[PDB]
């Protein structure tokens, strides 16, 4: 299958297979590692677990159509939302971690997730 730049970016921005701790320091480190700190991204959620379950959101296997050309997963995922605190847009970026467990909303292209809808984690 063709490479998809937006799928690759989705993984960088929104996937962490096997996370350490899922506390504030986890968020502060991973947001730096994934290139999300210049400027500090205000909110960002990572999905955990295997990738095949996330990809399957794009199919009937693990998703349903949602709103205007989004998809909502049938399964629930372990997730961690990183929320910026402090009032400055610029590093150092301090984050509060909120771990969760629920279904997720994505957009897909050619069977691959290319966007995470952050609204459900705000």
């Amino acid at each position: 299958m063709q490479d998809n730049s937006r799928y690759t970016h989705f993984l960088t921005q929104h996937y962490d297979a096997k996370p350490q701790g899922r506390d504030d320091r986890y968020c502060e480190s991973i947001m730096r590692r994934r290139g999300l700190t210049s400027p500090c991204k205000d909110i960002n959620t990572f999905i955990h677990g295997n990738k095949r379950s996330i990809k399957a959101i794009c199919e009937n296997k693990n998703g349903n159509p949602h709103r205007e050309n989004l998809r909502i997963s049938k399964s629930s995922f372990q997730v961690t939302t990183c929320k910026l605190h402090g009032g400055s847009p610029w590093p150092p970026c301090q984050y509060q971690a909120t771990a969760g467990f629920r279904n997720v909303v994505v957009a897909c292209e050619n069977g691959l997730p290319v966007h995470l809808d952050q609204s459900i984690f705000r």
Side-chain angles (χ1 to χ4, degrees):
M1 71 305 210
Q2 284 296 286
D3 291 327
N4 183 315
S5 59
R6 291 173 181 76
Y7 173 61
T8 301
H9 203 55
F10 175 94
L11 299 176
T12 298
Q13 290 197 311
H14 298 294
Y15 178 61
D16 183 22
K18 286 193 244 300
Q20 170 56 31
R22 305 156 68 188
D23 63 346
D24 291 1
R25 285 152 194 100
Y26 164 80
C27 278
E28 289 165 355
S29 180
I30 196 170
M31 294 297 284
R32 284 194 289 274
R33 288 204 302 284
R34 301 302 183 80
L36 307 174
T37 61
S38 221
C40 306
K41 199 173 182 277
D42 183 65
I43 188 171
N44 192 72
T45 301
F46 297 93
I47 305 169
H48 312 305
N50 68 53
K51 291 185 287 201
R52 69 185 169 284
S53 296
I54 304 169
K55 289 164 83 177
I57 304 170
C58 302
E59 314 175 66
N60 185 69
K61 186 171 177 161
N62 199 29
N64 295 140
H66 184 70
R67 302 303 183 209
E68 304 106 76
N69 242 303
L70 303 172
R71 300 204 45 101
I72 189 162
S73 71
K74 292 176 177 181
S75 71
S76 304
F77 292 85
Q78 292 288 338
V79 299
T80 308
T81 298
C82 301
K83 177 70 184 72
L84 186 65
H85 69 98
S88 175
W90 296 100
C93 308
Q94 294 184 73
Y95 283 97
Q96 280 155 355
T98 300
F101 178 66
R102 63 155 299 163
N103 62 352
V104 302
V105 174
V106 296
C108 299
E109 188 176 288
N110 302 324
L112 299 169
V114 297
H115 165 77
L116 188 72
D117 180 358
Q118 283 289 166
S119 71
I120 63 163
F121 302 108
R122 293 198 167 97

